[PDB]
Ligand binder design. Sequence first.
Ligand SMILES: CC(=O)N[C@@H]1[C@@H](O[C@@H]2O[C@H](C(=O)O)C[C@H](O)[C@H]2O)[C@H](O)[C@@H](CO)O[C@H]1O
Length: 742
Amino acid sequence: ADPYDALRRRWLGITLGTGYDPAAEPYASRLAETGERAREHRATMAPTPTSLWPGHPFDPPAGITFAYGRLWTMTEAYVQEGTGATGDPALLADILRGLDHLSATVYHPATTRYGNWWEWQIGSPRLLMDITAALYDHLGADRVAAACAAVDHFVPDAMLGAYTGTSTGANRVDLCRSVALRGVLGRAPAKIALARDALSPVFPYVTKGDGLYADGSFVQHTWVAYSGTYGQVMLDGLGRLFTLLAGSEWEVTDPGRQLVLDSVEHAYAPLIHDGLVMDTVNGRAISRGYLKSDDLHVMRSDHFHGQQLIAAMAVLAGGASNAERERWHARIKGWIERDTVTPVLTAPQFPVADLTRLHAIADAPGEAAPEPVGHHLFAAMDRAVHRRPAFTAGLAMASDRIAHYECGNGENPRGWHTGAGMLTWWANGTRADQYTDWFWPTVDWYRLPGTTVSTKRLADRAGGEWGAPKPDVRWVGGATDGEYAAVGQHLKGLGSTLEARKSWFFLDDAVVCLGAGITCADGVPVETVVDNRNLGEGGTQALVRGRHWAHLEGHGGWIVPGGALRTLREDRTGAWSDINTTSTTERRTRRWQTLWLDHGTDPAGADYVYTVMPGASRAALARRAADRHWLTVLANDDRRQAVSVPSLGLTAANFWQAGTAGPLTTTAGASVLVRRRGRTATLRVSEPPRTGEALEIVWDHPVGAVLRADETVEILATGRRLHLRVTPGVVCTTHECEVTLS
Ligand SMILES: CC(=O)N[C@@H]1[C@@H](O[C@@H]2O[C@H](C(=O)O)C[C@H](O)[C@H]2O)[C@H](O)[C@@H](CO)O[C@H]1O
């Protein structure tokens, strides 16, 4: 009786929110709008054998989930104060009418599932369980049993079996959501126990496939970097279920739960910049924008996705330690302060429950935390994040482990080169709307920023769906001290015969970008995209050019040979429906500044060097471009790419095979960063080929003593030089050694 009723009440608190004043803004307007939607839904609801609302047939099954969604809105209007429809028996009759129609015509145990599994096993049942919970006492026993038997039919015990296929990660968590509630609502303790127990395989760190990795990476669909959308769905579901079940017979007690809590700062926080979650980790969702089925008309975007992740963090914080909660709330206060693009505290997709959690954080005592300066190399998902005072940057690569891109379900048909060394960035202290402001629906998908590509025309969905296309390469990764980094990609171009070695050296106010071994036989030109910047509608930002640099007002600049650099400023018009079959067709115009190098047709061993200085002033760029001292390119070929930056005491090298660059030598493919600081230095080494075979490094500098070394590092010699043997493992860990200089 009572433990099932207690669980149902707890769920409704989580879902519909508690401890807010319905007459206070933003709650009052949000509730009122929910009443407005509910009244239009009610008036248009039109039951037929094949739909419940016009334009939304049950085949494809998206129409079923869409109908349950409108029924949930209707149910919110009925159960919440302030909606204009609270307790209206006419509205209640129409909800029950819709529910009965769905149960009679489509969502029932005689149906053999067709089309997208997700609609039947995740979209629809979670909504059906929510509506069943909220209306429980009005529905009667036959409606509740009917709902429970639909869920048993579409999500049978065997789905929360084997940790495989469609029952992994974010998906597993979503399945457990419906089975848990089905257990609560149907008073079926075994179903609740099964949902709790089935979460356990979600928690451990993984070394392959879907899940969280030790290095903070998050992978879904086997091969797709996905922290920003799937990872948010996992976090959301987990937070909700942890909160629901706490104190009950079915509380989640697995100690691996703690790894989920750890992931907040290790995995997710680094990818959030002033409210946005970087598009590098949003997979096919970058293409959504305005969705035709979204009755709130809220644009999907990096900021939209970041705000959903922030909301998930707020729910998870409720079961965290005091110390964890305090840190997460400070981060969240900071993202709230700095998000000027989509103000978190009035975000239009948040229902009142999310609003109340976020407002509680904003109102609590505590300081808003800045994003720390530092580097995060998520090697397991081939992503890097760099933060400096002047800028934030995200890099996307691809490898034999990590797909070039994800297309599927009509989404992201032209994202082919999102993994071709794509460097995204934001100038700190300016509005963070670069990628948000109709970027994806207007961009030239042949000229993504940072990438090297064949100009060969590609089909929509070229390479296959769901992360099918991976380049046939191993050496993708890098080495980092947590501040600076050497990062490298052995690139094989999607649908092309292009091969290249690209490297990035992330420094204190710049990213030095090296390209070598650029070879193609496609019979068309090959380009490297120095940058490609959305200027907004009607942009008039000045582009100023010099001998060996270019600068874009409000953005930053590039050190690059001025006679080689090609530039185009143009207006481009597009719609989200160009890149998503589920999106709206309205067309808008954005102005672009595009900068590239042309390697000609069928290059053989072509190369480039350029430096990007995001957020820099025109004078800073001019000075740096004229300064011969600050950077030495030690090597740039298909064997080794390496730099020296004396102002940082830094030598960094990506060794594509055994060899030497400046003062460093390696016996195998490796990434090496050395930092000298006064009388000591730190050497860091990783092995991006991931063979796990030992290799030796020599650093040609006098070294007196070894202060410390990781257990993976053996010291073979000190004196005139440092000679180390490293056993590097198979996950591209950076190993360290710290020595005193002579
Ligand atoms: C992670 C993802 O792309 N999932 C999609 C799904 O979209 C998600 O919808 C959920 C939701 O609660 O309904 C929230 C999340 O923010 C969003 O990305 C999409 O609706 C379905 C059907 O197309 O497919 C999943 O793969």
